[PDB]
Scaffold this active site. Structure first.
Site, mmCIF file in Angstrom:
data_model
loop_
_atom_site.group_PDB
_atom_site.id
_atom_site.type_symbol
_atom_site.label_atom_id
_atom_site.label_comp_id
_atom_site.label_asym_id
_atom_site.label_seq_id
_atom_site.Cartn_x
_atom_site.Cartn_y
_atom_site.Cartn_z
ATOM 1 N N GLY A 1 31.461 65.159 30.533
ATOM 2 C CA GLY A 1 32.202 66.207 31.276
ATOM 3 C C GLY A 1 31.216 67.361 31.420
ATOM 4 O O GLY A 1 30.107 67.385 30.746
ATOM 5 N N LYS B 1 25.200 68.620 23.957
ATOM 6 C CA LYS B 1 25.730 69.634 24.834
ATOM 7 C C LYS B 1 24.670 70.615 25.236
ATOM 8 O O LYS B 1 23.972 71.174 24.355
ATOM 9 C CB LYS B 1 26.821 70.396 24.072
ATOM 10 C CG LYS B 1 27.430 71.563 24.846
ATOM 11 C CD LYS B 1 28.580 72.151 23.950
ATOM 12 C CE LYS B 1 29.374 73.278 24.578
ATOM 13 N NZ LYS B 1 30.573 73.571 23.725
ATOM 14 N N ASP C 1 40.349 63.510 24.436
ATOM 15 C CA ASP C 1 40.734 64.874 24.212
ATOM 16 C C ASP C 1 42.263 64.948 24.310
ATOM 17 O O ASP C 1 42.934 64.078 24.951
ATOM 18 C CB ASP C 1 39.956 65.888 25.090
ATOM 19 C CG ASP C 1 40.441 65.935 26.580
ATOM 20 O OD1 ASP C 1 41.633 65.665 26.889
ATOM 21 O OD2 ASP C 1 39.612 66.301 27.447
ATOM 22 N N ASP D 1 39.780 80.035 21.964
ATOM 23 C CA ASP D 1 40.198 79.174 23.086
ATOM 24 C C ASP D 1 40.887 77.869 22.649
ATOM 25 O O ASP D 1 40.607 76.771 23.121
ATOM 26 C CB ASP D 1 38.934 78.914 23.905
ATOM 27 C CG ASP D 1 39.236 78.352 25.308
ATOM 28 O OD1 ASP D 1 40.361 78.502 25.851
ATOM 29 O OD2 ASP D 1 38.329 77.708 25.862
HETATM 30 O O1 LIG Z 1 31.495 71.041 22.014
HETATM 31 C C1 LIG Z 1 31.818 69.902 22.395
HETATM 32 C C2 LIG Z 1 32.247 69.689 23.713
HETATM 33 C C3 LIG Z 1 32.634 68.384 23.995
HETATM 34 O O2 LIG Z 1 33.062 68.141 25.207
HETATM 35 C C4 LIG Z 1 32.524 67.318 23.061
HETATM 36 C C5 LIG Z 1 32.827 65.999 23.325
HETATM 37 C C6 LIG Z 1 32.611 65.069 22.298
HETATM 38 BR BR1 LIG Z 1 33.110 63.402 22.612
HETATM 39 C C7 LIG Z 1 32.175 65.361 21.007
HETATM 40 C C8 LIG Z 1 31.827 66.668 20.776
HETATM 41 C C9 LIG Z 1 31.998 67.579 21.801
HETATM 42 O O3 LIG Z 1 31.722 68.880 21.504
#
Ligand SMILES: O=c1cc(O)c2cc(Br)ccc2o1
Length: 268
Positions: A11, A33, A91, A130
């Site tokens: 994403g 990330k 999620d 958030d």
């Molecule tokens: O900060 C984030 C954002 C994320 O979108 C995320 C997705 C997975 Br799967 C695992 C850890 C993640 O950590």
């Protein structure tokens, strides 16, 4: 770089671009990330890092209701964060899209784990700012929720906050009207939004006016005890909202399933 294999993009958005990854040294599933430097308003230190990295380091010792920062790297225009990644995972926003309103038993298990995670952040001196279904991962095999995305958070303090850049439909009415809120009580409001979202399948409020009015209409059949909790969390006056201890002592919160039982009964 050579420490990690990069997989598909998971994403992208206000939090950056997050990729699926695997740590080569032990095949640990990771998420990688990327945050752009010029898209970061808030910086801290230990050299200067995103606030998000300071907050993650403070919450990332052992207790697992928070996705942990395993490592981070600086690049010339970005930082790169190596986070834990449950596998399989979904999620809570997608889960709710698929399943609709959640059975109360499941919402109670999820909501309770969220409160333990947020208490942990607050014990560590970190305010998330958030909390919402999109910032919660479900480790589908263990039934464990994990907070992600500290990118709008702050050091917890006891004085008023006058900045906010998390999600408006979860922000409290003192933020909407005055641009001021205290950390815990704003948190508790977002937790009332989140709990409503779990049991009704959607958030109660879409527009500033509904937020300010604070009148809650249930579109799904929801128990009186659950409605009372949600309405207590969404009290208009910050100091009428429950503390985390009072949410957890609320009668709707009793007899929570363990995460593992939760995965067995509800997650397959
Ligand atoms: O900060 C984030 C954002 C994320 O979108 C995320 C997705 C997975 Br799967 C695992 C850890 C993640 O950590």
């Amino acid at each position: 770089e050579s420490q990690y294999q990069v997989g598909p993009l998971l994403g992208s958005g206000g939090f950056g671009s997050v990729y699926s990854g695997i740590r080569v040294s032990d095949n640990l599933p990771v998420a990688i990330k990327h945050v752009e430097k010029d898209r970061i308003s808030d910086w801290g230190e230990l050299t200067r890092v995103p606030m998000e990295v300071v907050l993650l380091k403070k919450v990332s010792s052992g207790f697992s209701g928070v996705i942990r920062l395993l490592d981070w790297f600086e690049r010339p225009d970005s930082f790169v964060l190596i986070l834990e990644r449950p596998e399989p995972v979904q999620d809570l926003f997608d889960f709710i899209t698929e399943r609709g309103a959640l059975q109360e038993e499941l919402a109670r298990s999820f909501f309770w784990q969220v409160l333990e995670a947020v208490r942990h952040c607050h014990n560590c001196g970190v305010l998330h700012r958030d909390i919402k279904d999109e910032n919660i991962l479900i480790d589908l095999n263990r039934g464990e929720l994990k907070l992600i995305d500290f990118g709008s958070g702050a050091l917890l303090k006891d004085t008023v906050y006058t900045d906010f850049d998390g999600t408006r439909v979860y922000s409290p009415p003192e933020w909407i009207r005055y641009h001021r809120y205290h950390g815990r009580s704003a948190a508790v409001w977002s937790l009332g939004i989140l709990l409503y979202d779990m049991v009704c399948g959607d958030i109660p409020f879409e527009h500033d006016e509904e937020i300010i009015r604070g009148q809650v209409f249930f579109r799904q059949r929801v128990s009186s005890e659950c409605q009372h909790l949600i309405r207590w969390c969404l009290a208009l006056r910050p100091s009428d909202r429950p503390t985390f201890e009072e949410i957890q002592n609320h009668p709707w919160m009793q007899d929570v399933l363990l995460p593992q039982e939760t995965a067995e009964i509800h997650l397959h």
